[PDB]
Every structure is written in C-alpha cells, then in structure tokens.
C-alpha cells in the first residue's frame, strides 16, 4: 500500500496553461518578478516580490521580454508582492495592490471564469477575484519554484499562505 507525498513537489519554473480547479502556489528564489499571467488578448498581469524596507525606486525588470520599468516601495518588515495589471496592449501599467507576508509565498487559481489570487497580509491574508472574458484560455509563466494543490482543500491552501512550507526541522 502506497501513500501520497505530503505535497505535490517543487516543480520547475516553466510556462504553460494550468487547467482550472487547481491552486498554483509559488515560492520565490530570486528578487523581482515571480510570475506573470495573461491571455495575450485582453489581460496581462504580473507580480514583483520586493524585500522589506526598500525605498521608492523606479526599477527595471525583464517583463514580457521587452524590459520595462515601474515603481516599487515597501516599509513593512514583511515581504511585499506588487501586482502589475493591464487590460490592453495600449494602456498604462496599472500598478495594483497587493500581497504581503513573511512566508515568501504567492498563490493563483482559476474558477468559474474568474481568476482568484491571494491578497493581504499574513496571518490575516485572504483571496480576491478578478474577472476577464475567455479566461479559460489564459497562460502563466513562472520564475521560481511552485507546487500544485486541488481546489477542494482551500482549508489548508489558506493555511499554507498563512504559514506554508511545513516545518523543515534540522
């Protein structure tokens, strides 16, 4: 008799289209961009993770291949996750807020033609939702490590966001 692994494994920073009903949780290894979602039609979103206690700076990131700039700042001692949002090729980079934590984790999901994402501050964090047409045909690409969880267990997905990566006792 075989048992399941405790978590579905730290997969590698790939680009693909995760089907629906699946939480994708990501932990960051470098600084800056962690991931970006889009559909290339009417939705382009990315995130940047920034170390706590950083000055307001217009930093340059290799986003979407063509390197673009935007402002980032943080005062809290916890990490900050600034989302960047755009709904058109011709548009301003609507810098949208946010998610903060010390777990160093982020999380996205697809459900009911709506993209859900974790938001707020741990342990108080929660999920919020964004709408978009033909959302089923979106794509994601990652730059750090990430797991997968089925949708049925938000009870421990949100607990992972609160304190994920169950203890690694030395």
């Amino acid at each position: 008799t075989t048992v399941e692994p405790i978590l579905d494994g730290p997969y590698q920073p790939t680009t693909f289209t995760p089907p629906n009903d699946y939480w994708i949780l990501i932990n960051s290894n470098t600084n800056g961009v962690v991931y970006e979602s889009t559909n290339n039609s009417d939705f382009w979103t990315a995130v940047v993770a920034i170390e706590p206690h950083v000055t307001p700076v217009d930093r340059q990131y290799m986003i979407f291949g063509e390197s673009k700039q935007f402002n980032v700042s943080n005062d809290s001692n916890k990490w900050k996750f600034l989302e960047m949002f755009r709904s058109s090729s011709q548009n301003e980079f609507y810098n949208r807020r946010t998610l903060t934590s010390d777990t160093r984790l982020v999380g996205i999901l697809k459900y009911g033609g709506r993209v859900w994402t974790f938001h707020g501050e741990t342990p108080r964090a929660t999920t919020d939702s964004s709408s978009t047409a033909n959302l089923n045909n979106i794509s994601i690409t990652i730059h750090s490590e990430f797991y997968i969880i089925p949708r049925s267990q938000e009870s421990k997905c949100n607990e992972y966001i609160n304190n994920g990566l169950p203890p690694i006792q030395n």
């Binding site: 048992v3 692994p5 405790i6 997969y11 490590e145 203890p167």
Partner: protein, 241 residues
C-alpha cells in the same frame, strides 16, 4: 486416463499424538538494501527491507540448542519522497515502512527433537513476549549540501500466528516453520530530517537494527504432532534380557 481413481499404497498402521511443550528463544535481525540511481548521486531508487538470515545457539535445560532463522516483511507500506526535481535535488523513489496494516514474518528452525518431529501436526499453539522494534539513524551520504539524516521509528510486535510451509520435489519434503507477527506502532515517530515528512508513525527500513546485534523474543511452544512411536507392542516375543 481421464477418470477418477484411488489405489491403496499400503495397509493400516499405528500412530500416537504426543504433546511436546518446550520453550523457545527466537532472535532475528532485520535486513535492508540500499541502491543508488544513475546520476549525480542525490536520488535513491530503493531503500527496502530484504530477507535477512542469521544463526545462533543457546541453552535450554542443558542440551545446547542451535537455531537458524530468516526474517522478512509482508504488507509493507511503500512511501516516496521528492524534495526537488533538479539533478542536484534530493529524492527517495521508494522507501519501505511498516504499519498496522503490515505483518512481519520470521522463519525459524532447530535440530532438536521437538522441532524435528514437526512433520505432521494436529494443533500448534504458542505464546510469545511482545517486544519493541526501534529504528536507528542513517546519514544519507550526499555529495553536496547538508546530509539529510533519518531518525526514530518505533513499533511493537504482537503474536499473530504460526505457519508450516512444505515444498515438494519428487516425494521429498522441504519444510519451514514461520512465525507471523502483527504490528502496533508506538512513539517516537520517525522522521527524515531536513525534510518535509516529519512526525510519522512507523518504522523505515533505513536502520532497523539500531546498532543492535539482534532482536530477541521468548515464549512457550506447544506442539501436538503425530509421532510414529510404538506402544511396546509389535515386537518379538523374546523381547527381553
């Protein structure tokens, strides 16, 4: 022929059913097999129990008793862990553990009269002392980074039954007596250090001996075999000094 058929190959005989009530000391040491995987040396393909043989002897009412046993496991759970997918990352494709679901078998035999008379049996009962099996530590020799180490693991053996396997090869019998023990887990839980899976109940195959030469169990041994022994009849009339 394609037909039912019976022939008598002899006529009747005489047999008694004598009772042999001895006592027994079975000692056994587990066996583990560890194998690499083709690569840098961070993925271990197998760490599983394996058949482990062991001989010994002891004293029992004076007459020295030589005993020879081989232990193995059945119903073994097979866990798996993948700390990462890179070549550099660490992984165990499959490691064996034992749980309440699992049984553990110990084949045992001896060249004493009581055991040699076990060819035909009407009933074989016995009671044994339950014992604790503890798991030692194993340093996963890793050519980079901090070595993971496994620790803990504690179970208890309860008596489940006795079995007599008998292979046949052209009218000659190759027999083997086997003791089946059920398991009941116990603290402290085992855990692979610097790793996800912590505080799990069981006993992995990494270091079951725990630095001990053997795990010993004592008990009583009741056999109701069917001897060929006469009753002092069927013997010539001048059977005397």
């Amino acid at each position: 022929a394609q037909v039912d058929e019976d022939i008598i190959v002899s006529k009747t005989s005489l047999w008694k059913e004598m009772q042999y009530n001895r006592d027994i000391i079975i000692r056994f040491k587990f066996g583990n097999s560890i194998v690499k995987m083709g690569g840098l040396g961070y993925k271990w393909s197998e760490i599983s129990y394996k058949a482990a043989n062991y001989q010994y002897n002891y004293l029992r009412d004076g007459e020295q008793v030589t005993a020879h046993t081989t232990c193995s496991v059945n119903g073994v759970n097979n866990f798996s862990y993948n700390g990462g997918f890179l070549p550099t990352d660490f992984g165990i494709s499959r490691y064996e553990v034992i749980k309440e679901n699992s049984y553990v078998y110990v084949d045992y035999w001896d060249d004493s009269k009581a055991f040699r008379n076990i060819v035909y049996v009407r009933s074989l009962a016995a009671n044994l002392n339950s014992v604790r099996c503890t798991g030692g530590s194993y340093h996963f020799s890793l050519p980079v980074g901090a070595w993971p180490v496994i620790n803990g693991g504690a179970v208890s053996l309860h008596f489940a039954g006795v079995t007599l396997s008998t292979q046949f090869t052209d009218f000659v019998s190759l027999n083997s007596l086997r003791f089946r023990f059920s398991l009941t887990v116990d603290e402290p839980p085992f855990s692979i250090l610097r790793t996800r899976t912590v505080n799990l109940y069981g006993l992995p195959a990494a270091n079951p001996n725990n630095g001990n030469e053997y795990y010993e169990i004592s008990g009583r041994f009741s056999l109701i075999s069917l001897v060929p022994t006469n009753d002092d009849y069927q013997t010539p009339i001048m059977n005397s000094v």
